[model samples]
Target chain A: MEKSVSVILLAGGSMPKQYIPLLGQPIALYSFFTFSRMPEVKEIVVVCDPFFRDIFEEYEESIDVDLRFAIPGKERQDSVYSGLQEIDVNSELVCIHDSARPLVNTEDVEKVLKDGSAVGAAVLGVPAKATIKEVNSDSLVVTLWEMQTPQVIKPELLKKGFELVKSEGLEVTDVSIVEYLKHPVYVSQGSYTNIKVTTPDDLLLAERILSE
Target chain B: MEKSVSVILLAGGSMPKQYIPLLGQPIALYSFFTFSRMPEVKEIVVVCDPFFRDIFEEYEESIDVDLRFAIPGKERQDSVYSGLQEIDVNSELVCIHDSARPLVNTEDVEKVLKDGSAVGAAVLGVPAKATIKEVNSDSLVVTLWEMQTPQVIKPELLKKGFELVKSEGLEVTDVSIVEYLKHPVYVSQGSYTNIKVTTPDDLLLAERILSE
Candidate 1:
């Protein structure tokens, strides 16, 4: 039997920031195109504001995959949970990705999904190329690995992790929610190109990354 | 009086892999050119294998700054110390750099040097863009800063740190030798472009960075 997968692409903003031009089109379009093309991905739930809903509705006609939209919440976790409610009950795996990271490739998405299927939870990350230090009043050098997304996990495991988060009143970031649940979240190697387009320089870097 | 600065550029591999072309010329030449152009840098001691000595010697006449060579030791720390021995006695500041990081800009070099001069030691680094973790048998998420080079320090202080390293039989990596001696090594902001050309992908990244 084929494994059912759903992608929660969190693009939630009051304004349509995802519609911001990266190379030539909206930044969110790149990841949307990548995920929609994957046969393994059964559905995509784009969690966005009213601004993107109209934009996506117009763009939805062109895409082949099953797509839906949900309004975002005040926080990222809130938005993710809202997106989760919309996913099909039969979806065995859920991939939570930041739509801002427009450079995420198809290979990385598939890798994380497969890894998650085996381990119950997995994320895309890269090894630290530089010496990392924990700096404060007094500093201690620590071994570091950099975490990226799409963070894939079993649908039920993620639901339970979120439940634990709510019960503990824990403010968590990304897959650290699962880590907080005392479950091992395996890391798969992601590319240097898979960067979040946060700053203006990042947008420029994305242009170069996409060109190559 | 203006501070006299010397650089220990670690290029210590045999047959000059540093001679490998990045944009158009040898990868090592980019940082060498940047350092030589700085009016404050009096001398640069490129610690490399015998293969690069003739190449550097041939190119040295075109540059106004004094250039010298030293043979590398078994390890990176050993090579840095070997290059340190060759610095002019009057040199007040030593800038230790990796020749592999060809994209290191003049501004970052100057920032680290000025910061190091004000305090005892300083290094160029960038804030981690991704969620960082100390992943081992058990994982711990930690705040991390990524260290880059042209780690600047006072000549005498660095020498003392190296002495302490030898006395303690400690294996040191980068400026952490000074850290081991309980000295505060200040961190200055470094650019994303200041990446080490360690692999083929890095070389491609360097080309794109340089083009921009």
Candidate 2:
């Protein structure tokens, strides 16, 4: 039998922007529910605001695995690092995904696991289909570089880099970048819809995505 | 235990446009040979032109599964129907995917099978990011309805539909459409990168896709 995998759902409080409603539910709710359905994932440790635990409690009845929640920290890195310690050492693999990307499907997770098993590190990325450019703070486009495809990475390295960020008190945005500094990370091409919900417009767009 | 799933490599005369150069040997050879590596898939059926049997034979030493090939007819449906007849009746589910879509990862297949088993039919579909429309022979844009998402259907329904299409001698592009007359098919949203290669530019795209 294949080793069972573990997942840590970073169900921390939604961005102030996600408070703007699109379809009635909070934007983060979509991702929280979507990750609840993955079969290979044996257990989940959802780290959210202590107040939001009741909101996430409703999901426990529907999900197949053990569901647990943690109180959030001062920063996102602290929340993830804290979530990592919650998983038992015997757990074979741990996947730390954001609560805002509602469109990250199970297939992508399986591919990352399979590929990560071989290389020990992989991260999800998509080929920037649009003309990508280095932009100034004023929102003006600068230098253009042809976009390359993205990949999936290993959880342990991600955890290591994440821990480093916490100890240094660095504000890291993505899990892969932290892991990349500690070890080589593979990139797995992901969907364009997998965007982090950052604004009111993004929440509306996420609703539109679900309706489709 | 889940019933074992078998893989069918629907090989045309050549590699789908993107995978052309990747085919130093026969495309079917690469198709069947790759299918052998998947641990869960128990058997493989390669449907091809009778002329290409020798091409398949050359790779027999490297080919995997209980592998065999059927001669493709003038149309895609012909080869699929023939391949279905060749398999055992005890086979409960059939995953009719395009061999051109080699990038269809295991998670997509798992999603297809999960939905297919619950209902009768399921096919991969990526929700269109761009608004789609029908273009006329004169290049005039037509009114937009929703694009067809892939459908999963019952084997019996598919066989009946094939017979009906054969009797009328009408051309059909996709097979899952046949089951539509009886029931609404489930549309599992698939990844966009799973492109169907039918042209030269597509072949170059596939190589770039796999290499990256």
Candidate 3:
């Protein structure tokens, strides 16, 4: 039997005007577009603040996928939980993606899902291009790899991890949530062009990348 | 007395044709040009293979600063040592930079040298834009900052660091060499556009960055 996959497009923040002008539409719309083109993606649940509800509705007709929405919470983890609740009971895989990262392509998405479904959890990232260092108070050094997203996990594993997070009162920035549970998550290499549009400079780079 | 600064432009690698045509001149010449424009910089030593001597000599006449050359060694540290040896005895600070990182601007150069001169060692780097992690065999998670160049240091400290590195038979990728000797190297923020031209894609990005 083919496993069903659900996408939780976390668009928690208020959309900034600088990024909107880049693609002739809202930046989150690009993530929506990418997932909609993937045949394997059964449904996409966009979690956003009330401010973006009208804009999302305005673009709903253009979105050619089994789409739905969830109201985001004060925190990213809370927003993710809201999105997870909206997933169909039959969904075996859930891909937690940041809508801020609009440049993620279909190939990387498929790779993450494929690897996640097989290994139970997977993440999308690129190799570190520069020499990375950990500088402590005493200036001790250790090298590290940079993590990016489209973090895919089995719904049940994520549910268990989040449950533990709440019980422990643990705060995490990304879905390395499973790591806390001592579960191994496979890494899928993605493109350097798949950048999170955070600043004005990032928006400019996104425009150039998309244009290319 | 004004402190004299000499630049060691590490152009040791075999020149690739893709990077050569970036500004319709040798890519290494960009760093040469940037340093020549800085009044604080008294001498520029380009470290390259003997094969590039003719090209370096051809560009030397066009350069407006005190220009010289040193033959590179098998390792980066060896090349650095060769360049360090060539610095004038009166030189107070030596700025070691990769000729491959052509987009490094004047402000960053001054910042690193200024900080290094004050604190004895400083390196140019940008804060990690992505979520950084260190995944080990047991799936341990650690974060990191990416290191770039030009790394500015007082000549005596670097010479001492090399001495320790040789005695310990230790290998290093960058100026973290001083850190191994229990010396603190300050960090100076540099532009993200200051990228090392390693791949074909990087060369293309450099072209676009330069065009912008």
Candidate 4:
């Protein structure tokens, strides 16, 4: 029997900041296309908001991925949990990725997935180039030498951490959040071009990077 | 009758940094070879240390350039004057370039030579990328806005200025010095890769740029 790997792309609701530039094709569709090309990955589940269900249906002709969607809950954590419940437990691995990072090459994704065998999970990251520091609400610089460290974790351990920490007033942005709360996470080098498009300038830069 | 142009490459005693890694050929050799290929350019005069003449001579079998060397005096002005004196006035236009800048693209050189018709002398330059300030040895930053804006001048004027300012203690670096002295000089935007190989690191960068 062929080994199965589930790739649950959390691409629900109004497009995230990074995916806004994907006008003709939704961000989820782009992520789905990339996921479908991976030889090791068998299934792709897109947990999208109820209003965006039909947004991905048109891509059935182009993508061979097994598409699925869910009504987005009150929070991103709840939506992700709903998607996990829908996937088959027999899958050898589960990969959760943001739809906005189109610049993430396939080589990096494969490297992370392969490395995840030793350690339960791995995520792409880059060494912090600038010296970061804490700043007050007024934008006044305060403490210095604040470094953004890398963290990766197993899917099962991450899910458990999310359930316990969801109500602790902790703002969860990335997969690392769950790992930090539940178990130790692994960190690997990420590309500088892996940008989360947030503003007008970011949309422009993304177009430039994707043009060729 | 085919119009001929005199090409003067400034290669004073300083050895080109990219001599080792450039397929065992010196960086200046590339510049000389590129200039020789130009249909309009007939003579290739090299202004460098007198001792380095043998190196150019050794490459005569491979290079089709009419190589002649000029002895550089202590300063930039002295060196340039020596180069000008060696050139025959029978040539239609005189082209001066830095031998260390091997990345000067053929298109840019053609544009500058062709554009020199409107302005007696034309030199390649690009707009400064960052806001620049003049700082003293004591680390006091001088306000650049308060100073008079620098003017662009012709190469003939620059040559005259060099002759007049040779005795003065004031130091200026570029061929623009000759232009500032008398005639109008045209400034064309040059490629960023057209870097002068001054240090070892710069030579490596030139090689990388060439490879790209």
Which candidate number has the best lDDT? 1
For B1-212, candidate 4 gives per-residue lDDT tens digits of 13366777777854345354464678777777778777867677788776667767786666554667788878755766687777655766677776777777777777677656556665665533212322234221220011000122233554567666665645533324542344545555457667666655455556566667
TM-score of chain A of each: 0.91, 0.75, 0.90, 0.77
| Model 1 spans with C-alpha error above 4 angstroms | A11-42, A48-65, A73-78, A90-92, A99-111, A114-120, A137-142, A154-184, A189-212, B1-3, B14-26, B37-39, B58-64, B138-142, B160-175, B197-212
Query: What lDDT would each prediction earn against the true structure?
Result: 0.80, 0.55, 0.78, 0.57
Q: Write the per-residue lDDT of candidate 3 for residues A136-159, one digit (tens) a residue.
A: 554334334557779889999999
User: Can you write out model 2's per-residue Cα lDDT over A1-212, one digit (the tens) per residue?
Assistant: 14355667676753444334447776556656655666656677777777667766777888787776666677765676677777756666677777666666667777766655566655565543322222234222121111111232345666666667646654623333443374544555557667666644455556667677
lDDT of 1 by residue, B1-212 (tens): 25388999988854345677986888888998999888889999999888667767877888878898889999888898899999988998999999888889899998888888887788888876668776664333324578889888898899888898788776734346787777678888889889888655567668777877
lDDT score at residue A193, model 4, on the 0-100 scale: 64
List runs of model 2 lying over 4 Å from the truth.
A1-212, B1-3, B13-19, B23-34, B54-64, B134-153, B166-169, B174-180
Q: lDDT tens digits, residues A1-212, model 1?
A: 24378999989863345667986888888898898888888788999877567656676767666888888898878998899999987999999998889889899988888888888888888876668776664333324568988988888898898898888776644346687777678888889889887655567667777777
Which has the higher DockQ value, candidate number 1 or candidate number 2?
A: 1
Top candidate, metric DockQ: 3
Model 2's alpha-carbon lDDT is 0.55
Tens-digit per-residue lDDT, B1-212, candidate 3 = 14388999898854464237685877787887899878888888989877777766776666666887888899888899999988988888999999888889999989888888887888887767667665655333423456888988899999999898888776755446687767678777789899887665567678778888
All candidates' chain B TM-scores are 0.92, 0.74, 0.91, 0.78
Candidate 4 residue A133 C-alpha distance from true site, Å? 36
Instruction: Show the colliding residue pairs in model 1.
Output: none
Candidate 2 per-residue lDDT over residues B101-155, each given as its tens digit: 6566566666766676676665555434422222234222221111122233456
